[PDB]
Amino acid sequence: VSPIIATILLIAITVVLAATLVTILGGFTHGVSNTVETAGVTSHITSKYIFINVSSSSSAISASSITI
């Protein structure tokens, strides 16, 4: 009797460890993305205005997505 019952208990424990491991991995598998951007920018500053002129960029992006 007892060696089979001990085996059933060890299977039950194994599933909870595997379920625990899955929640540990979830802290690694997020928030990685390609955020690199590169632009040719020139600028001139005066007592009233900043002028900004763009010559090229790595990608086309919305002017609302850029913070100054």
Ligand X SMILES: *[C@@H]1O[C@H](CO)[C@H](O)[C@H](O[C@@H]2O[C@H](CO)[C@@H](O[C@@H]3O[C@H](CS(=O)(=O)O)[C@H](O)[C@H](O[C@H]4O[C@H](CO[C@H]5O[C@H](CO)[C@@H](O)[C@H](O)[C@@H]5O)[C@@H](O)[C@H](O[C@H]5O[C@H](CO)[C@@H](O)[C@H](O)[C@@H]5O)[C@@H]4O)[C@H]3O[C@@H]3O[C@H]([C@H](O)CO)[C@H](O)[C@H](O)[C@H]3O)[C@H](O)[C@H]2O)[C@H]1O
Burial tier of 46 (Cβ tally within 10 Å: 0-12, 13-18, 19+): exposed
Q: Mapping DSSP to helix (H, G, I), strand (E, B) and coil, where does residue 1 land?
A: coil
Q: What is the distance between the alpha carbons of residues 24 and 17, in angstroms, rounded to a whole number?
A: 11
Site membership for a copy of itself, residue 13 (CB under 8 A): yes
Nearer to a copy of itself, 9 or 68 (CB): 9
In the list 29, 55, 62, 67, the residue contacting a copy of itself (rule: CB under 8 A) is 55
Under rule CB under 8 A, which residues in 22-51 are in contact with a copy of itself? 23, 36, 38-40
Taking the complex as a whole, the smallest distance from the CB of residue 7 to a copy of itself amounts, in Å, to 13
